[PDB]
């Protein structure tokens, strides 16, 4: 009930007013800790033209607890599993109270423009991406048309 006030207020006000280019967001009516974020699939990326939904949850001790983010929209990505779980380091081990939400949001949007190989977790998509890149793209492009478009 006693935390780091100014920062959460200011970080939120920024997310719903002064947000990162290509990222908009609307807070959840029920819980004020959950944010309904929307990221636009970048250009020259397989997701171009798609608007993906992400769930942003700010835990109890947010600054001292990495925030929780996940794709609520399906997507063929070597770094996002079937459940929507993103595989970003600054969300896992490498998270610090010194990093803000923008850091994570930016990181994710960067990941769409250019997926990451250096990924220890086992994933079929990943496998197809690094070998059959050609087809893998074709497929992401089609999933962006199915799940990431007309999805609102």
């Amino acid at each position: 009930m006693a935390g780091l006030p100014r920062r959460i207020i200011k970080e939120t006000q920024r997310l719903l007013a002064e947000p990162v280019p290509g990222i908009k967001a609307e807070p959840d009516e029920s819980n004020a800790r959950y944010f309904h974020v929307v990221i636009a699939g970048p250009q020259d990326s397989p997701f171009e033209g798609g608007t993906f939904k992400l769930e942003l949850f700010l835990p109890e001790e947010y600054p001292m607890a990495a925030p929780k983010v996940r794709f609520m929209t399906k997507i063929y990505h070597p770094n996002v599993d079937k459940l929507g779980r993103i595989c970003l380091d600054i969300l896992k081990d490498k998270w610090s109270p010194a990093l803000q939400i923008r850091t994570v949001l930016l990181s994710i949007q960067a990941l769409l423009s250019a997926p990451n190989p250096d990924d220890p977790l086992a994933n079929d998509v990943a496998e197809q991406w690094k070998t059959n890149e050609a087809q893998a793209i074709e497929t992401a492009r089609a999933w962006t048309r199915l799940y990431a478009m007309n999805n609102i």
């Binding site: 935390g3 780091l4 006030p5 100014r6 920062r7 200011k10 970080e11 920024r14 600054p63 380091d89 600054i90 081990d93 490498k94 998270w95 610090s96 109270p97 010194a98 990093l99 803000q100 923008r102 850091t103 994570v104 930016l106 990181s107």
Partner: protein
Amino acid sequence: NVNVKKLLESLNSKSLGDMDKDSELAATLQKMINPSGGDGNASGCALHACMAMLGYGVREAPVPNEISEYMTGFFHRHLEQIDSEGIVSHPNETYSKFRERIAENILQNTSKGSVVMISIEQATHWIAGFNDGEKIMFLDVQTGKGFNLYDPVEKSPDAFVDENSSVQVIHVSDQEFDHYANSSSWKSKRLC
């Protein structure tokens, strides 16, 4: 390799203003402490500005996935000096009127050529403060600007400060500075 306060005069006495020579130096250092940057490594970039103004030298600042190396501890520690409501802009107060008013919990509680970590909106953002003796120099070095309140574009001298804008100045021990120069995180950062 114009390292150390060598060009500390090359970017100080000219036809440039006070709030003007800031964005000056920072823009230089930025090119060394944050080769093309703009993410969340603010905290790291600022700790490095103090590092250069304290003499230790300029080293590429830590990037997002390296912040936890040391920064998570610095926070660990100085947290009470951050969860403070610190200085707060008054209604209608301008950017210069606030930068000057802030250069007090500095100029006063200062030293010969000492530095400080300035927290913006309680860890929302960071900038480094340097006391040259008579005035103060605020350096962002992450986006290479002078004093600002996490603004994409450096704001005009007489723009209005948003309501309730707050900055907590962080007094940083010289030991803390020596502790970081003796840390692996620091020694592993690319020099210059």
